[PDB]
C-alpha cells in the first residue's frame, strides 16, 4: 500500500541499484549480451541497454523514474545513456552514510551539490580544443559509433553524410548556434541500390505519390506555390454534411461546387507554376484542374516542411489561394524530378541554395540494410551536433572519470566538517566506469585499478586510460576514444540530479 | 537428499562454504565479544549486572571480572581472551584496549575481504603498520615522572588509573594508595604488587579508610594480650574443640559421674596442649576455625596471643611471608614449622580493632591498605581499582615515559600512519589505512559512553591536530561536545601500557585471520 | 440489539480518532518549512506527483476516515480565508488530540477538556495582540533589507546581498497606492524583470519606470519623446485589383487621423504597415509594432490609455542603450505603481536564476508591507505562549488547570518540527528558546533577550526583528482559532453508528 520512514530511502536504493546491476556488463565494446524471455517463448539477445530496460516491467516507482530519465537522455544524446544509470546507481550504492551513520539527507545532498561543481570545473582543465575545418579529425571522432558495425567499409562515406548535413542545419548568426535534427535534418529511405550510392540531397524531398499520369517529369527552373488551405467547395462553420434529396437542388449545389473550385484553381495557374503544394488534402474535382494544367499535385505537407521550401526556392506561404501574389515563385530551384526511384514515387525540389536544411537519401539493397544504415547515421549526426556546439574533447576509456576522482581527493583534505566523508564517496563512485571495462575484458580488476590510480598521481591526468579491447593501460593521445565534452557534462549533471531526487523522497503515498 | 551439506567431511562439524565466508563468521563471534565490554570503556562506562556462579548478585564495570564470569565457548574468541590474560602480564592496565581494538581490526578486515583482496596480503599490511606505530610512539611522549617519591607527584599521575573504575572518589584513592607506594620505593627493583595488600572492613564509607604498615587482619585479637614481641608464631588450621585420637581412642561412658571425670581430664589435657605451645617459646597462636571457650582462658593464663583467621587466603598469606605452616593435628609441639616476626600488636583504626604484623627491626616492603564500606560488593569494586592503581606504578619502576589519554595519542598516531600508507605504493596500502582507522574506535567509545555524537568528536580532533596543536584529547562532559588540552588537565597514560597493548592486540587479530576453518577431533 | 449496520462505542472510538488524525499529520509533518523534503503522490493510474507543499498534498491526499475528512474540510477554511499555514494547523490539531487522549485516561471528562482549550485560545490571542508590531520601518531603518536578503541567500544571487536588496526595497515602496480609505496593499503583478548581458552582475541598474523590449524600426523616429500623449492600438494598420488599391488608400486616412490626435508614443499590437511606418518619420512620432498584449496591458494601466479618450498621460519617454536590445523607458505616467528592473550579467543561467530569486524576494517584502501588523515567526510565537499559558493555568483551577497546561506544551511541536527538518538537535533548540522567553517574563530588563526566533540554517537562536523573518498576524490568529475548533469537534464524538 504505502511505505514510510527509513524504509523509503533504503527501498529507493535497492530499487535503483537493481536496475543498474543489469546493464553493468552492457558498457564497452566487449560488453556481454543478455537474454529476454517473451511471454510466448521468444528470445531477444540484443545487448542494447535502451532496449533491455524498455521491455522489463518494473514494479517500484523509483525504478520507473530511472527509465524515464534515461529515455529523455536518448533524445538529446544517443550515446552514454548506459553510463548515466551506472553512475546514478553507484552514487546511491553506498548506504553507510545514509542510514547507519544516522546523517540527515540534506547534509548528504549538500555534499553532492558541492561535488557537482568540482566535477564540472575539472573536465574543462583536462579538455582539448578541436579544429572543425579539418574533416580528418572529425573522422576518428565519429568512428566511435561506427566501429563494430557493418558500415565500417562505407565508414569513409558515413562521415561525410553526417558532417555536411549538420553543418547546413547549424545557424550561427543567432549566437546560440541552435541545431535541430528532428525537422531540418529529416531523413527518408530509398529502396534499391547499394550503401555506396547513398548521398546527401540538398533540399526537401516529399514522399507524396503520383496520383495522375499528367505531371512535370523534369524541369530546369521549377516553380513552387505554397498555400495552407485545402482545395474544396467552401462549407459552413460547422461539420454538418450537405444532404440533398431533390434533383433540381442537386444542380444548384453542383454548380456552386464546380464554380468555386475552378475559381481558386484559376488564380493558382495564373502564375503558371510547376506544382501545387497544399497543407491539407485535395479533393477529386480539384485534381481534375491540376492534371489539365500538366502540373504536379502535392498535398499533406506540414508547416515545418513548408517553412523549409519557402527559403529554398523562394516561395511564400499564403492563407488562401485567392490571395496568391507574384511573390510566391519557385525561381532558383535546380530541378524537379517526379521520377520513380526504387519502385516508389519521389519528389526533388533540390537546388543550389542552403535553406538551413537538407535531406538524407538512404540507398540500400534490402530493407534490412536500410534499417541498419539508418540507425547508424542517426547517432552519428548527433555526434556531429555535440562537437559543433562545444568543440572540446576529453580522454575516454575511463581516463576522464579517474582524472576527476583525483581532483576530488586532493581538495577534500582542505574541507573541514562532517561533509568530507560523503564528498570523498563521489571520488570512489566514479571508479565504476573503468571497473566494468576491465571486468568485461577478463583481466584482474584490483591489480589494474590500483596501478591506474598511481598514474594519475604522478603523470598527467589527461592520458593513461584503460584499453577496452586489450585490457592493459594506454594513453588516450594514441587512441581514438576521445569523446565530446557536451556528452560528459550532461552525463554527470544527470547522474547527480537523479541521485538527489531519490534521496529527497522520504515517503510514498498513494492517492488522487 | 543430494545435494547435501558442503565442505563437511569430519564429525558433522558445521563448516561454512565460500559463499558463507567462514572467516567472516569467525569475526562475528569476535565482534559480539567486543560489544559487551565496549560500553564499559572510559570513566562514563556503564555498569554491568553479573550473576555469580554461586548465584550472587554483582554489579561491576570491571572488564576482567566480566570475562571470568562469562564463559566464552568459541575457540577463535578465546584468542582475544588469552590476549587479555597476557595483557595482565608486564602491565596491569589496557584490558579494554585489546578487546575493543582487536575487534576493530577484524571488523575493518571484512571490507577488505569483500573487495577480493587476499587474506595473506592483509596480514602483511598489519605487521608493517605495527612496526611503524612502534617507531612513532616514542615521539608522542609528552612528560615523564621525576621519581622524587613525592606524594603530590605520585597522587597526581594516579588519578588517570583510578578513573574508568571508581569515579568521583579518585581524590581519596589517589592519596591513600600513594602513601603505601612511596614507602616501598626506597627499595630498588624489588617493588611488586604482592607487597601492597587489601583488607576490607564493614564501615560507614570510603572516606573512613586509612593505610597501615605491615600485615593487617580485619579480625580483632580474641585474647586479652595487647602486644607481644615473640618471633615464634604457631599457625594451625585445626580449630579448638574436643580432641580426637588418631588411634582407636574409644570412650565408654555409663553413669553420670563419668561425664564429669572425662570432661575434667579433657580440660587438663587441653592445659598441657596450651602449655606445650608456651614450652616451645611460642606466644602467638593462630586458629583457622572455631575457638573453644575453655582454651580461650589458657591463652590469657600464659599470655599467649590468640589469632582467629576464617579465610583460607589469609592463612596462605602468612605461609609465604613469616614461613609458618598449618598442621592437621591440634596444637602439636612443632617448633620447626613456626614463623618469624619482629613485632605483633593490636591497633584500632576506624573504631575497629585490627591485628597488625609489623617488623620493627627489619624495614620490610610490606604494607596494607585498609578499606571501609557499607557493602561488600562495593568494597570489592574498590579493590579492583587498587590492583589496577598499584600495577600502574610497578611499570614506572622501569623507564618513565607518559602519553596523554582521552584519545589524544590515538588520533595523532592514526594521522601519522595514514600519511605513511598514502605514500606507499602497492596493495599493502589498503590494510595500512584500515589499521589507522582502527585507532578511531577508541575516541568513539568515549563519545558514545558520554552521550556525545561520535562523528562530531572525530571531526574536531583532526582540526586541532592539523594546525600543529598536540596533546589534545576528548573533554568528558554531557553537554560539552568540544575538546580540551590533556596536559593542562593532568590526564596521562603509560608508555609501556600502550606499547605492549598494541603488540598483543595485533598478534591476536592476525592469528584469527590465519585460521579459516574449525575442525573437531578426538584422541 | 439487532440493527441494519455495525456500531461501536467506548473510549476506543476516541483512540481510533486520535490515531487517525495523528497519521494524517505525520504525512505533512516533515514537509513543514522551506527545507522540507519532497514527497511522492501515487495516483490510481500510477502517475507520480512530487511536491513539498502541504496545502497541495492535502488536496490530492485521499484517505477514507470519518475524522480525517474533518481536517481536510478545515484546510479549505484556512486556504480561502488566508491561504497559508495549512500545514501548521494540521500539526497543531493533532497534538491537541494526543494530549487530550492521555487526559481522558486520567478520568478527566471531555467537557472539562473542551472548556480548557476555549479559555486558553482566548488568552493566547490577547497575549499575541500585545506583542505585535504595526507596519513601519520602511524608509530609514532595516526591517526589509535583511528580510529579502535571507530569502535570496539560497541561490547564486546571494553573493552580494546588500546591493541587490536595495533595488528590491526601493521598488516595493514606489508601487504603493492607497486609493481607498488608506488601505494600500501591493498588486499581484509586480515590477517587470528583464535580462541582459552586462559582463557582470554588479552592472544591474534600477529604472524608475517601465521598460518595454521592442524596436522602433526605421531610425528616422526620434528616440527622445517629451510628449505626454500615448496611443494604444490593438487594431493593426496592415492588410481583386481595386481591393488592393483601396486598402492602401484607406490606410492613408487611417494614418492622418492618428497623427491628428498628437500622440507621439504609439504602440500597436497586430503591427504597423511598412508604408505607415514611413509616415511617422516626417511627423517625428515614435511608433512601435508587434507589441506584446500582456506588456501593453500594463502600459494602458500606467498611462491611462483606453484599450480625448485613447490618449494617455506621460512626461518623458527615452529609448536607452542596452546590450543586444534597446529598451524603451517611459517615466512619470498618470498612475502606474510599477517599474522595471534590468538584470545585467554574464550569461542567461545567472539571469534566469536571479529572476526567480528576486521574484520570491519581492513577495517576502510585499506580504509584510500589505498586512497591517506582523509578528516574529520561526517559532517565537509558540515558545512565548508556552511560558505564559502555563503560568496562567495555575490561577484558574476547577479542573481546567490540566487542560490549559497541555495546550501550552502542545504548541511546542512547531519549533520542535522545524528543528528536525533543519538537521539540528531538536531538544536543545526548543530548550534554548523557552529559556530566553522565560527571562523576559521575569523582569522587563534589556539584559534578557526578547522576540528570539529559530534559525534553520545556522541552527542557533537569533532575533527575527533584525533578521527580518516576519509573518502576518492573521496567520497566527486564524491558525490557533481553527486548530482549536478541530480538536473540539473530534473529541465530542463518543460513538460511531454505521449502516
CSV table of C-alpha atoms in Angstrom, one decimal, chain A residues 61-273:
chain,number,residue,atom,x,y,z
A,61,UNK,CA,8.0,3.8,-8.8
A,62,UNK,CA,11.6,4.9,-8.4
A,63,UNK,CA,12.6,2.2,-10.9
A,64,UNK,CA,10.3,3.9,-13.4
A,65,UNK,CA,12.0,7.3,-12.8
A,66,UNK,CA,15.3,5.7,-13.6
A,67,UNK,CA,14.0,4.6,-17.0
A,68,UNK,CA,12.0,7.8,-17.9
A,69,UNK,CA,15.1,9.9,-17.3
A,70,UNK,CA,17.2,7.6,-19.4
A,71,UNK,CA,14.6,7.9,-22.2
A,72,UNK,CA,14.9,11.7,-22.1
A,73,UNK,CA,18.7,11.4,-22.3
A,74,UNK,CA,18.4,9.5,-25.6
A,75,UNK,CA,16.5,12.3,-27.2
A,76,UNK,CA,19.3,14.8,-26.6
A,77,UNK,CA,22.3,12.5,-27.0
A,78,UNK,CA,22.2,9.0,-28.4
A,79,UNK,CA,25.4,7.9,-26.5
A,80,UNK,CA,26.4,7.5,-22.9
A,81,UNK,CA,22.9,6.5,-21.7
A,82,UNK,CA,24.2,3.3,-20.0
A,83,UNK,CA,26.9,5.3,-18.2
A,84,UNK,CA,24.2,7.6,-16.7
A,85,UNK,CA,22.4,4.8,-14.9
A,86,UNK,CA,25.6,3.1,-13.7
A,87,UNK,CA,26.8,6.3,-12.1
A,88,UNK,CA,23.3,7.1,-10.8
A,89,UNK,CA,23.2,3.7,-9.2
A,90,UNK,CA,26.8,3.8,-7.8
A,91,UNK,CA,26.4,7.2,-6.1
A,92,UNK,CA,23.4,5.8,-4.3
A,93,UNK,CA,25.0,2.4,-3.8
A,94,UNK,CA,26.8,3.5,-0.5
A,95,UNK,CA,24.2,3.4,2.2
A,96,UNK,CA,26.7,3.7,5.1
A,97,UNK,CA,26.4,7.5,5.5
A,98,UNK,CA,22.7,7.4,4.6
A,99,UNK,CA,21.4,5.2,7.4
A,100,UNK,CA,24.0,3.5,9.6
A,101,UNK,CA,25.8,6.8,10.3
A,102,UNK,CA,22.4,8.5,11.0
A,103,UNK,CA,23.1,11.5,8.9
A,104,UNK,CA,20.4,13.8,7.7
A,105,UNK,CA,19.7,13.7,3.9
A,106,UNK,CA,20.1,17.4,3.4
A,107,UNK,CA,23.7,17.1,4.8
A,108,UNK,CA,24.5,14.5,2.2
A,109,UNK,CA,22.6,16.3,-0.5
A,110,UNK,CA,24.7,19.4,0.1
A,111,UNK,CA,27.8,17.2,-0.4
A,112,UNK,CA,26.8,16.1,-3.9
A,113,UNK,CA,25.8,19.6,-5.0
A,114,UNK,CA,29.2,20.9,-3.9
A,115,UNK,CA,30.9,17.9,-5.6
A,116,UNK,CA,28.9,18.6,-8.8
A,117,UNK,CA,30.6,22.0,-9.4
A,118,UNK,CA,34.0,20.5,-8.9
A,119,UNK,CA,33.5,17.7,-11.4
A,120,UNK,CA,32.5,20.3,-14.0
A,121,UNK,CA,35.5,22.5,-13.4
A,122,UNK,CA,37.9,19.6,-13.6
A,123,UNK,CA,36.7,18.4,-17.1
A,124,UNK,CA,37.4,21.9,-18.6
A,125,UNK,CA,41.0,21.8,-17.4
A,126,UNK,CA,41.9,18.4,-19.0
A,127,UNK,CA,40.0,19.0,-22.2
A,128,UNK,CA,41.5,19.8,-25.6
A,129,UNK,CA,40.2,22.0,-28.5
A,130,UNK,CA,39.2,20.8,-31.9
A,131,UNK,CA,39.6,22.2,-35.4
A,132,UNK,CA,36.2,21.7,-37.1
A,133,UNK,CA,37.6,22.8,-40.5
A,134,UNK,CA,39.5,19.6,-40.9
A,135,UNK,CA,37.3,16.6,-41.8
A,136,UNK,CA,40.0,14.2,-40.9
A,137,UNK,CA,39.8,14.9,-37.2
A,138,UNK,CA,36.1,14.6,-37.3
A,139,UNK,CA,36.5,11.1,-38.9
A,140,UNK,CA,38.1,9.4,-35.9
A,141,UNK,CA,35.6,11.0,-33.6
A,142,UNK,CA,32.6,9.6,-35.5
A,143,UNK,CA,34.3,6.2,-35.8
A,144,UNK,CA,33.5,5.5,-32.1
A,145,UNK,CA,29.9,4.7,-33.1
A,146,UNK,CA,30.9,3.3,-36.5
A,147,UNK,CA,33.2,0.6,-35.0
A,148,UNK,CA,31.9,-3.0,-34.7
A,149,UNK,CA,29.3,-2.2,-37.3
A,150,UNK,CA,28.7,-3.3,-40.9
A,151,UNK,CA,29.1,0.2,-42.2
A,152,UNK,CA,32.9,0.1,-41.4
A,153,UNK,CA,33.6,-0.4,-45.1
A,154,UNK,CA,31.5,2.7,-46.1
A,155,UNK,CA,32.6,4.5,-42.9
A,156,UNK,CA,34.5,7.0,-45.0
A,157,UNK,CA,31.2,7.8,-46.7
A,158,UNK,CA,29.2,7.8,-43.5
A,159,UNK,CA,31.4,10.6,-42.1
A,160,UNK,CA,30.7,13.0,-45.0
A,161,UNK,CA,27.0,12.3,-44.7
A,162,UNK,CA,26.6,13.3,-41.1
A,163,UNK,CA,29.2,16.1,-41.2
A,164,UNK,CA,27.8,18.1,-44.2
A,165,UNK,CA,24.2,17.6,-43.0
A,166,UNK,CA,24.6,19.1,-39.6
A,167,UNK,CA,26.8,22.0,-40.9
A,168,UNK,CA,23.8,23.0,-43.1
A,169,UNK,CA,21.3,22.9,-40.2
A,170,UNK,CA,23.5,24.9,-37.9
A,171,UNK,CA,22.6,28.6,-37.7
A,172,UNK,CA,25.4,30.5,-36.1
A,173,UNK,CA,24.1,34.1,-36.6
A,174,UNK,CA,21.7,33.9,-33.7
A,175,UNK,CA,24.6,33.3,-31.3
A,176,UNK,CA,23.1,30.2,-29.7
A,177,UNK,CA,24.1,28.0,-32.7
A,178,UNK,CA,20.9,26.0,-32.5
A,179,UNK,CA,20.7,22.7,-34.3
A,180,UNK,CA,17.5,20.7,-34.8
A,181,UNK,CA,17.8,17.3,-36.4
A,182,UNK,CA,14.2,16.2,-36.0
A,183,UNK,CA,13.0,18.9,-38.5
A,184,UNK,CA,15.6,20.3,-40.9
A,185,UNK,CA,17.7,17.1,-40.9
A,186,UNK,CA,14.7,14.9,-41.7
A,187,UNK,CA,15.7,11.6,-43.3
A,188,UNK,CA,13.8,9.3,-45.6
A,189,UNK,CA,14.8,5.9,-47.1
A,190,UNK,CA,15.2,4.9,-50.8
A,191,UNK,CA,14.7,1.3,-51.8
A,192,UNK,CA,17.2,-0.1,-54.3
A,193,UNK,CA,20.9,0.4,-54.9
A,194,UNK,CA,23.9,-0.2,-52.5
A,195,UNK,CA,25.3,1.6,-49.5
A,196,UNK,CA,27.8,3.5,-51.7
A,197,UNK,CA,25.0,5.1,-53.7
A,198,UNK,CA,23.7,6.9,-50.6
A,199,UNK,CA,24.4,10.6,-50.8
A,200,UNK,CA,23.2,13.9,-49.2
A,201,UNK,CA,20.4,15.6,-51.1
A,202,UNK,CA,20.4,19.4,-50.8
A,203,UNK,CA,16.7,20.3,-50.4
A,204,UNK,CA,13.5,18.9,-49.0
A,205,UNK,CA,12.2,15.7,-50.5
A,206,UNK,CA,8.5,14.8,-50.4
A,207,UNK,CA,7.2,11.2,-50.4
A,208,UNK,CA,3.9,12.1,-52.0
A,209,UNK,CA,2.7,9.6,-54.6
A,210,UNK,CA,1.9,10.3,-58.2
A,211,UNK,CA,-1.9,10.1,-58.5
A,212,UNK,CA,-2.4,11.1,-62.1
A,213,UNK,CA,-0.2,10.4,-65.1
A,214,UNK,CA,0.0,14.1,-66.2
A,215,UNK,CA,2.7,15.9,-64.3
A,216,UNK,CA,6.0,17.6,-64.9
A,217,UNK,CA,8.7,14.9,-65.0
A,218,UNK,CA,11.8,17.1,-65.3
A,219,UNK,CA,12.1,20.9,-65.1
A,220,UNK,CA,15.1,23.2,-65.4
A,221,UNK,CA,13.6,26.0,-63.4
A,222,UNK,CA,10.8,24.7,-61.2
A,223,UNK,CA,8.0,26.9,-59.8
A,224,UNK,CA,6.5,26.1,-56.3
A,225,UNK,CA,3.4,27.6,-54.7
A,226,UNK,CA,2.8,27.1,-51.0
A,227,UNK,CA,-0.6,27.6,-49.5
A,228,UNK,CA,-2.2,26.1,-46.4
A,229,UNK,CA,-5.9,25.8,-47.2
A,230,UNK,CA,-7.3,22.7,-48.9
A,231,UNK,CA,-9.0,22.9,-52.3
A,232,UNK,CA,-12.7,22.1,-51.8
A,233,UNK,CA,-16.1,23.6,-52.0
A,234,UNK,CA,-16.5,26.2,-49.2
A,235,UNK,CA,-18.5,24.8,-46.3
A,236,UNK,CA,-20.2,26.4,-43.3
A,237,UNK,CA,-18.7,27.0,-39.9
A,238,UNK,CA,-19.8,23.5,-38.7
A,239,UNK,CA,-19.1,20.0,-40.0
A,240,UNK,CA,-22.7,19.2,-40.9
A,241,UNK,CA,-22.8,17.4,-44.3
A,242,UNK,CA,-24.9,18.6,-47.2
A,243,UNK,CA,-27.9,16.3,-47.9
A,244,UNK,CA,-29.9,17.0,-51.0
A,245,UNK,CA,-33.0,14.9,-51.7
A,246,UNK,CA,-34.1,16.8,-54.8
A,247,UNK,CA,-32.7,16.7,-58.3
A,248,UNK,CA,-33.3,20.3,-59.1
A,249,UNK,CA,-31.4,21.4,-56.0
A,250,UNK,CA,-28.5,19.0,-56.9
A,251,UNK,CA,-27.8,21.1,-60.0
A,252,UNK,CA,-27.7,24.2,-57.8
A,253,UNK,CA,-25.2,22.7,-55.3
A,254,UNK,CA,-23.1,21.0,-58.1
A,255,UNK,CA,-22.8,24.4,-59.9
A,256,UNK,CA,-21.6,26.1,-56.8
A,257,UNK,CA,-19.2,23.2,-56.2
A,258,UNK,CA,-17.7,23.4,-59.7
A,259,UNK,CA,-17.6,27.2,-59.7
A,260,UNK,CA,-15.6,27.9,-56.5
A,261,UNK,CA,-13.1,25.0,-57.1
A,262,UNK,CA,-12.5,26.3,-60.7
A,263,UNK,CA,-12.1,29.9,-59.4
A,264,UNK,CA,-9.4,29.1,-56.8
A,265,UNK,CA,-7.6,26.8,-59.3
A,266,UNK,CA,-7.7,29.6,-61.9
A,267,UNK,CA,-5.8,32.0,-59.7
A,268,UNK,CA,-3.2,29.3,-58.9
A,269,UNK,CA,-2.4,28.7,-62.6
A,270,UNK,CA,-2.3,32.4,-63.3
A,271,UNK,CA,1.4,32.5,-62.4
A,272,UNK,CA,1.8,29.2,-64.3
A,273,UNK,CA,3.6,27.2,-61.7
